[PDB]
Amino acid sequence: SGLVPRGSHMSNKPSKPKTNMKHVAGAAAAGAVVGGLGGYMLGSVMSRPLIHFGNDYEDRYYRENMYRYPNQVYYRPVDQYSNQNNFVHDCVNITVKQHTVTTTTKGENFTETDIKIMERVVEQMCITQYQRESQAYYQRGAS
Numbered sequence: 001s002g003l004v005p006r007g008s009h010m011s012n013k014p015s016k017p018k019t020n021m022k023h024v025a026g027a028a029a030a031g032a033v034v035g036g037l038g039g040y041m042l043g044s045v046m047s048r049p050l051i052h053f054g055n056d057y058e059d060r061y062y063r064e065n066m067y068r069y070p071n072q073v074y075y076r077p078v079d080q081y082s083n084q085n086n087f088v089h090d091c092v093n094i095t096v097k098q099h100t101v102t103t104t105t106k107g108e109n110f111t112e113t114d115i116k117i118m119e120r121v122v123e124q125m126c127i128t129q130y131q132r133e134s135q136a137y138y139q140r141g142a143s
Contacts, residue, residue, distance in 0.1 A: 068110040073125035091126035
């Protein structure tokens, strides 16, 4: 018997870094205790409509209220339990704990209407997260 593990790093293949920022200063991130409990695979956005309210006030207030609250959802597949109804629960689970943290320094800044908006954006990330896995279940199994 013999153990023959794998690894892309074990090969020590020739790398090819293409970035000048590496040899250039600017900004840095501090906080060991922070990253120690981070490393989240939070999604991202660049193109396509996020909420697509359709109105001017909704899109205007939302754009300015983008910092008032998180618009993305935190990922955390590290869990044995699993359920459809509980699925979305995770989207708000991590979002809630992280949400209060942001308001731990202030406690209140957003307006009354901002809430109604924050509720929608949060419902889009939770609803869009579920459909995601669904695409895999549908393709592999077109019931």
